Amino acid sequence: QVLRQGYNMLNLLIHRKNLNYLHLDYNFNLKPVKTLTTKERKKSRFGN
């Protein structure tokens, strides 16, 4: 559950920012699904 919760909860934060070109896979690797524009790659730069 804590993994389902945490996974869902990070996905919501991605979607809350409309970063729908990022994908959080189930082992929590954060993959860009497409080559990123300067706008997209700036906008999607999550922090620590």
Partner 1 sequence: FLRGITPLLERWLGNLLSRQFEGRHSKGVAKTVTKQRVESHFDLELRAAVMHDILDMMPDGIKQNKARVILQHLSEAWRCWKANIPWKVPGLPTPVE
Binding mask 9-48 toward partner 1 (x if CB under 8 A, else -) reads ----x--xx-----------------------------xx
How long is the chain? 48
User: Please, what is the minimum distance in Å from the beta carbon of residue 37 to RNA?
Assistant: 7
> Are the CB atoms for 40 and 21 separated by under 8 Å?
yes
Task: Work out the angle at residue 2's Cα, subtended by the Cα atoms of residues 33 and 32, and round it to the nearest 5 degrees.
Answer: 10
Q: Is 15 a binder of RNA (CB under 7 A)?
A: no
Stretch that binds RNA, among 1-9, 24-32, 35-43 (CB under 7 A): 35-43
DSSP reduced 3-state for 45: coil
